[PDB]
Amino acid sequence: ASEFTLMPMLITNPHLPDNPIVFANPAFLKLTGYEADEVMGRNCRFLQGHGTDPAHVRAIKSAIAAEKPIDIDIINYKKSGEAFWNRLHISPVHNANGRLQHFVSSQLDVTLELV
Numbered sequence: 001a002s003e004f005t006l007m008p009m010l011i012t013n014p015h016l017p018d019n020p021i022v023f024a025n026p027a028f029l030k031l032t033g034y035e036a037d038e039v040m041g042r043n044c045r046f047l048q049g050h051g052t053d054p055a056h057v058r059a060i061k062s063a064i065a066a067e068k069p070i071d072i073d074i075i076n077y078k079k080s081g082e083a084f085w086n087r088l089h090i091s092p093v094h095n096a097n098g099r100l101q102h103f104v105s106s107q108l109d110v111t112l113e114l115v
């Protein structure tokens, strides 16, 4: 049966409108309290909320638009509403031919480090 990295991971498909999540591993679903069918097909921004710094969101949007990687700590929210610091690593995935195919991320709850 399936096994995945124990680090939270998402893959999104930028060929679909709004770059939706197409894969979330069980580690991400454990981290955020969501079900796979609640996260797949959505842009990851649903994790943000009233405490999320708009500057962080713009830095991510910028890196994505540039197809560059970004490492950023951002305030996000579990399904329960519980706020946490999410250490986000986002990378584009480019084919050997150079064309953008996916984005992939690592996520980690770093609340205990920052608070």
Ligand SMILES: Cc1cc2nc3c(=O)[nH]c(=O)nc-3n(C[C@H](O)[C@H](O)[C@H](O)COP(=O)(O)O)c2cc1C
Residues within 6 Å of the ligand: 010, 011, 012, 019, 043, 044, 045, 047, 048, 057, 058, 060, 061, 064, 074, 076, 086, 088, 090, 091, 103, 104, 105, 107
């Ligand atoms: C692979 C990937 C993973 C992402 N993971 C998160 C995440 O965990 N939390 C978050 O707030 N945004 C995450 N984002 C960022 C949002 O999807 C979006 O790019 C960001 O909010 C900037 O765009 P917007 O201004 O349209 O919202 C991720 C983006 C990608 C491509």
